[PDB]
């Protein structure tokens, strides 16, 4: 009851805006760095 | 001179040495028998000597300048420097009740002696090294986000 | 003995550690007889008595009931002041108008 | 009123060409059955909320995303067969090993969570 | 506690209340044992149910 | 509840991951015409 | 009754498959076909029994060689495992090293007594009085047992199982606050003894649960 | 007013970092309790308020900038909070000081760029966010 | 071994299904609406 239920937006915002950043940090390295390694391996074979 | 060090028979020997060194760490458990305790610390110094013998022999075969070229060789001498310090300090008048735990986790760092020759994902490691300015900046932005929400949560629910 | 119980009722004792304190004070009053004189006081930036007694009382079955009831009705709020809490406790042990 | 006002201008023969209006009508009949029956019952009162997706999904950009992925799911039905076969194999094995464990209220194996029945 | 001839107690939970609130009688009896045989006086309680 | 979990969580997580990976891939071919990959290959090729 | 009727159905089922398998052998004189003999072979031999009764779950698995799309999808899975086989070696080495470090830190320190008033096995014996829900007016007599945590770091095998559950983000706060209170080798917990020991769990989650589990998914995508 | 190009810019940046540490070492006590360390940090708050007020009144000589708008609003709330508290959930109003650590992103050009990329990458995800909102609304009404 | 092996297998096949669906949509996910696409033809058909 009362206005104590409105404070729940802190945890909703922290969860939504927190897990979104995690997908733009750890998954931004898995795709912008591992793809380079595969591309580097693809180019390494042609030169070798 | 340097034929033995770069020989293929030397490659297998150091692989074996890393194996039982790891086994001396992974065999430790709660309520372990006294005899197994006696094996671990005895073999801690024995494998230290063999690594030191491998350390001393390797140094007097190629030249100091070439060793510092390799990134791992500087790291490899770092571990053995703490390995000898561990035994001399333990047997000395320093009890260091927690110092055993931290040092035993340092000689575990030579397991990477076998992962330096994959040839299959070492190019991935090179990609994670020149992107440090991009990796660190993203990690710090996440840290600043956590710091702000931790201080905000101290006000509301402190 | 002439006991004087100081109960810390500052803000930081609110919660479980206040329920423990109230049960602890009530349990220590059970170790008293008609030959011992007791009074309970509390302090949070101001030291005051928790009951109507204002000095040491005989600690019989009726007086202890008053103290036990008052101890089970204290709330935690304010800051901690040991200097004001200990001055109040030491002054009440030097009264000597009353039977001790 | 919309249902009758549409057929008198679009004809019943062509009214069923559109996909949305084929199911949109069923809500009208469903809604009017229970209001007549108001003065068993949850089957048609629940369909009242379903009218939200019937017309408010007209935004181009979200419908395309939904349609493209749903069609992609339909085009790869054998990949989801592994998950069902994985669930079938592990559920059957679970009944033999852990199916005889007694259910207790305070335990994790309780009346709601157990291995006693395949579902 | 011991700047004033007392003793220090910890009561972290309900189970510690019963014992820690009666251990202060060990400290109070210190001058009573140092008195010697002059502290060996027979006393009588109030009336209580056995 | 089971349909809510499958549609709400498993399906949406597929959309978020697919769309987010679609933006990490979009910059991958875009960055090809910036020389970052060639510079990284140039230093890697001559490191050996 | 249901098992008997189902058993009756299995009687007629194995007759169809054993008759069908003979036409295959009469007309042909590989590994997938060898599986057909294995599955039906369990039935006749059954007709410890528990091992064979569990083993008859291979019935749906033999349907692979009777569907064009099912063979390809299964084949793609084993090829996909081979590609991701390199990542599963690094992440297993990283978990093993963390488990060995964790053993050095919390070896035997997760023990505690049934009543939170005794902090060593010597006095954690006999009976004690438990107050239900903290009420002093409802005491009850309980035995005190020097118990151990279900997930602990006693050895490397227990540490790896305890660390695996952390990577799934299930019950890891419980293990985190159990490790913070870890005082000593064979003594009970102390409230918030070493908060700084949480660095071990924070580093492991970032390195393994975040970095490796996402570089794994990114590997499959590219 | 003319020297604001580089020399003391680190100092104002270092002032925010120092203010962050003052916020971290504060201990929120239950029921209006406090200790000696919290007593000093209130005085340090007065020192930090003046530094961020002088600079705000010095950069006016910026007002339409997004980052400068955030810097201005926290100061005026800061003066409003200290004034109203002195002349008396008032302590709940000081939660706007938690936005001061956010000023560290604007002080590092090399670190503000990564933040901007993330913010402009939310546009393709807004269609998904809209779909999730409808699904939760539909299931809430069904429930 | 029953629960630990199931968790790894279920997690592996779930992302196997997730990515495979994502694979069938790179044409739409990387649509690049600015330049052109089949959506323009759909508008042409509608006007036609
Ligand atoms: C993405 C791709 C995924 C591919 C598929 C992967 C598998 C997904 C599994 C998740 C769905 C789980 C659905 C089964 C849950 C059924 C349930 O909870 O039923 C319980 C109840 C029976 O209750 P009762 O047997 O009386 O229990 C008394 C003692 N507790 O209910 C009943 O009355 C049971 C009868 C209704 C259920 C029928 C059996 C359905 C099993 C297959 C579901 C497939 C979806
Ligand atoms: C009783 O204690 C009080 C202090 O607690 C003593 O102080 C006297 O209080 C009375 C009442 O005001 C006055 O006589 C004086 O103000 C105080 N001093 C003296 C010397 O009387 C008091 O002396 C004690 N004894 C009595 C009989 O009151
Ligand atoms: C060199 C290393 C990596 C070899 C692999 C180590 C494996 C095979 C060995 C090394 C130490 C061994 C452990 C040593 C001590 C114990 C405690 C005992 O009560 C149960 C078995 C258990 C847990 C052993 C299991 C097997 C074990 C983990
Ligand atoms: C990548 C992995 C395998 C190696 C890197 C992990 C190292 C850096 C981590 C692993 C566990 C960590 C330790 C965890 C707990 C403590 C106890 C604390 O009171 C001091 C720091 C200390 C000692 C940490 C230091 C850093 C540490 C040793
Ligand atoms: Ca206090």
From Swiss-Prot, chain C:
Binding of a divalent metal cation, residues: 8, 10, 12
UniProt note on tissues of expression: Isoform 1 is expressed in skeletal muscle. Isoform 2 is expressed in the central nervous system. Isoform 2, isoform 4 and isoform 5 are expressed in neuroblastoma cells. Isoform 3, isoform 4 and isoform 5 are expressed in the aorta.
UniProt-annotated glycosylation sites, renumbered to this chain: 73, 97
Post-translation changes: Proteolytically processed into subunits alpha-2-1 and delta-1 that are disulfide-linked.
Organism superkingdom: Eukaryota
Entry's family note: Belongs to the calcium channel subunit alpha-2/delta family.
Summary of the function given for this chain in its UniProt record: The alpha-2/delta subunit of voltage-dependent calcium channels regulates calcium current density and activation/inactivation kinetics of the calcium channel. Plays an important role in excitation-contraction coupling.
Domain notes per entry: The MIDAS-like motif in the VWFA domain binds divalent metal cations and is required to promote trafficking of the alpha-1 (CACNA1) subunit to the plasma membrane by an integrin-like switch.
Disease: Developmental and epileptic encephalopathy 110: A form of epileptic encephalopathy, a heterogeneous group of early-onset epilepsies characterized by refractory seizures, neurodevelopmental impairment, and poor prognosis. Development is normal prior to seizure onset, after which cognitive and motor delays become apparent. DEE110 is an autosomal recessive form characterized by profound global developmental delay and hypotonia apparent in infancy followed by onset of seizures in the first months or years of life.
Subunit structure: Dimer formed of alpha-2-1 and delta-1 chains; disulfide-linked. Voltage-dependent calcium channels are multisubunit complexes, consisting of alpha-1 (CACNA1), alpha-2 (CACNA2D), beta (CACNB) and delta (CACNA2D) subunits in a 1:1:1:1 ratio.
Name by which UniProt lists this protein: Voltage-dependent calcium channel subunit alpha-2/delta-1
Organism: Homo sapiens
Gene name, Swiss-Prot/TrEMBL: CACNA2D1
Residues of the full protein shown: 252 to 351 of 1103
From Swiss-Prot, chain H:
Tissues expressing this chain: Expressed in pancreatic islets and in brain, where it has been seen in cerebral cortex, hippocampus, basal ganglia, habenula and thalamus. Expressed in the small cell lung carcinoma cell line SCC-9. No expression in skeletal muscle.
Residues carrying sugar: 35
Source domain of life: Eukaryota
Compartment annotation: Membrane
Oligomeric form and interacting partners: Voltage-dependent calcium channels are multisubunit complexes, consisting of alpha-1, alpha-2, beta and delta subunits in a 1:1:1:1 ratio. The channel activity is directed by the pore-forming and voltage-sensitive alpha-1 subunit. In many cases, this subunit is sufficient to generate voltage-sensitive calcium channel activity. The auxiliary subunits beta and alpha-2/delta linked by a disulfide bridge regulate the channel activity. Channel activity is further modulated, depending on the presence of specific delta subunit isoforms.
UniProt disease link: Sinoatrial node dysfunction and deafness: A disease characterized by congenital severe to profound deafness without vestibular dysfunction, associated with episodic syncope due to intermittent pronounced bradycardia. Primary aldosteronism, seizures, and neurologic abnormalities: A disorder characterized by hypertension, hypokalemia, and high aldosterone levels with low plasma renin activity and an elevated aldosterone/renin ratio. Other features include generalized seizures, cerebral palsy, spasticity, intellectual disability, and developmental delay.
Entry function: Voltage-sensitive calcium channels (VSCC) mediate the entry of calcium ions into excitable cells and are also involved in a variety of calcium-dependent processes, including muscle contraction, hormone or neurotransmitter release, gene expression, cell motility, cell division and cell death. The isoform alpha-1D gives rise to L-type calcium currents. Long-lasting (L-type) calcium channels belong to the 'high-voltage activated' (HVA) group. They are blocked by dihydropyridines (DHP), phenylalkylamines, and by benzothiazepines.
Protein name in UniProt: Voltage-dependent L-type calcium channel subunit alpha-1D
Lineage of the species this protein comes from: Eukaryota, Metazoa, Chordata, Craniata, Vertebrata
Portion held of the full protein: 121 to 289 of 2161
């Amino acid at each position: 009851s009362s206005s104590g239920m409105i404070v729940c937006i802190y945890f909703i915002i922290l969860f939504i805006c927190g897990n979104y950043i995690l997908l733009n940090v750890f998954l931004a390295i898995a795709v912008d760095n591992l793809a380079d390694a595969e591309s580097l391996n693809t180019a390494q074979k042609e030169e070798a | 001179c340097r034929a033995a060090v770069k020989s293929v028979t030397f490659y297998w020997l150091v692989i074996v040495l890393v194996f039982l060194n790891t086994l001396t760490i992974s065999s430790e458990h709660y309520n372990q028998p006294d005899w197994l305790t006696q094996i671990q610390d005895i073999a801690n110094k024995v494998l230290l000597a063999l690594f030191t013998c491998e350390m001393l022999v390797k140094m007097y075969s190629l030249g100091l300048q070439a060793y510092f070229v390799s990134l791992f060789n500087r790291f490899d001498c770092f571990v053995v420097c703490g390995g000898i310090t561990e035994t001399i300090l333990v047997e000395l008048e320093i009890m260091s009740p927690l110092g055993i735990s931290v040092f035993r986790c340092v000689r575990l760092l030579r397991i990477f002696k076998v992962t330096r020759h994959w040839t299959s994902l070492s190019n991935l490691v090179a990609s994670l090294l020149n992107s440090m300015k991009s990796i660190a900046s993203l990690l710090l932005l996440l840290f600043l986000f956590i710091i702000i929400f931790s201080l905000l949560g101290m006000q509301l629910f402190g | 003995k002439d006991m004087l119980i100081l109960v810390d009722v500052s803000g930081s004792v609110s919660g479980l550690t206040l329920k423990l304190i109230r049960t602890s004070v009530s349990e220590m009053l059970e170790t008293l007889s008609d030959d011992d004189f007791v009074n309970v006081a509390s302090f949070n930036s101001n030291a005051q008595d928790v009951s109507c007694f204002q000095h040491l009382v005989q600690a019989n079955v009726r007086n202890k009931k008053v103290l036990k009831d008052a101890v089970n009705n204290i709330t935690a709020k304010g800051i901690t002041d040991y200097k004001k809490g200990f001055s109040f406790a030491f002054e009440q042990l030097l009264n000597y108008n009353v039977s001790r | 009123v919309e249902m009758v006002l549409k057929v008198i201008a679009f004809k019943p023969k062509g009214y069923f060409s559109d996909a949305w209006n084929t199911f949109d009508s069923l809500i009208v009949i469903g809604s009017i059955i229970d209001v007549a029956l108001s003065e068993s019952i949850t089957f048609f009162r629940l369909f009242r909320v379903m009218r939200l997706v019937k017309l408010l999904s007209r935004g181009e950009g979200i419908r395309t995303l939904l349609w493209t992925f749903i069609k992609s799911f339909q085009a790869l039905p054998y990949v989801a067969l592994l998950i069902a076969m994985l669930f079938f194999i592990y559920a059957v094995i679970g009944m033999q090993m852990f199916g005889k464990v007694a259910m207790r209220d305070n335990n994790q194996i309780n009346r709601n969570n157990n291995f006693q029945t395949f579902p | 506690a011991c700047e004033n001839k007392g003793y220090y107690y910890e009561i972290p939970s309900i189970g510690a209340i019963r014992i820690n609130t009666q251990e202060y009688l060990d400290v109070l009896g210190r001058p009573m044992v140092l008195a010697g045989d002059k502290a060996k006086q027979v006393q009588w309680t109030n009336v209580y149910l056995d | 509840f089971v349909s809510l979990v499958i549609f709400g969580s498993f399906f949406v997580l597929n959309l978020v991951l697919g769309v987010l990976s679609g933006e990490f891939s979009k910059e991958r071919e875009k960055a090809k015409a910036r020389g970052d990959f060639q510079k990284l290959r140039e230093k890697q090729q001559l490191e050996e | 009754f249901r098992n008997t009727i189902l058993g009756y159905f299995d009687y007629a089922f194995t007759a169809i498959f054993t008759v069908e398998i003979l036409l295959k052998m009469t007309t042909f004189g590989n590994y997938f076909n060898l599986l057909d003999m294995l599955v039906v072979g369990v039935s006749l031999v059954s007709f410890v029994v528990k091992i064979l009764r569990v083993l008859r779950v291979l019935r749906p698995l033999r349907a692979i060689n009777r569907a064009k799309g099912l063979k390809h999808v299964v084949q793609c899975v084993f090829v996909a495992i081979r590609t991701i086989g390199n990542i599963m070696i690094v992440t297993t080495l990283l978990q093993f090293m963390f488990a060995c470090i964790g053993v050095q830190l919390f070896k035997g320190k997760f023990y505690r007594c049934t009543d939170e008033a005794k902090s060593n096995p010597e006095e954690c014996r006999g009976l004690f009085i438990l107050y239900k829900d903290g009420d002093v007016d409802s005491p009850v007599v309980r035995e005190r047992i020097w118990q151990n945590s279900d997930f602990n770091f006693d050895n490397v095998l227990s540490a790896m199982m305890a660390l695996f559950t952390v990577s799934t983000f299930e019950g890891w706060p419980a293990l985190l606050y159990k490790a913070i209170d870890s005082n000593g080798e064979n003594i009970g917990p102390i409230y918030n003894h070493r908060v700084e020991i949480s660095i071990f769990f924070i580093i492991y989650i970032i390195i393994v649960a975040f970095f490796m589990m996402n570089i794994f998914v990114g590997f499959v995508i590219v | 007013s003319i020297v604001e190009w580089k020399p003391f810019d680190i100092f104002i940046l270092l002032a925010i970092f120092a203010n962050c540490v003052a916020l971290a070492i504060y201990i929120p006590f239950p029921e209006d309790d406090s200790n000696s360390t919290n007593h000093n940090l209130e005085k340090v708050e007065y020192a930090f308020l003046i530094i961020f007020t002088v600079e705000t009144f010095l950069k006016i000589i910026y007002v339409r900038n997004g980052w400068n708008l955030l810097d201005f609003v926290i100061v005026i709330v800061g003066l409003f909070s200290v004034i109203l508290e002195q002349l008396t959930d008032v302590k709940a109003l000081r939660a706007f000081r938690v936005l001061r650590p956010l000023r560290l992103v604007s002080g590092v050009p090399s670190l503000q760029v990564v933040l901007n990329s993330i913010i402009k990458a939310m546009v393709p995800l807004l269609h998904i966010a809209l779909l999730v909102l409808f699904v939760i609304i539909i299931y809430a009404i069904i429930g | 071994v029953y629960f630990i092996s199931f968790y790894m297998l279920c997690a592996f096949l779930i992302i196997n299904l997730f990515v495979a669906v994502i694979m069938d949509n790179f044409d739409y996910l990387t649509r690049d609406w600015s330049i052109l696409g089949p959506h323009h033809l759909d508008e042409f058909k509608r006007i036609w």
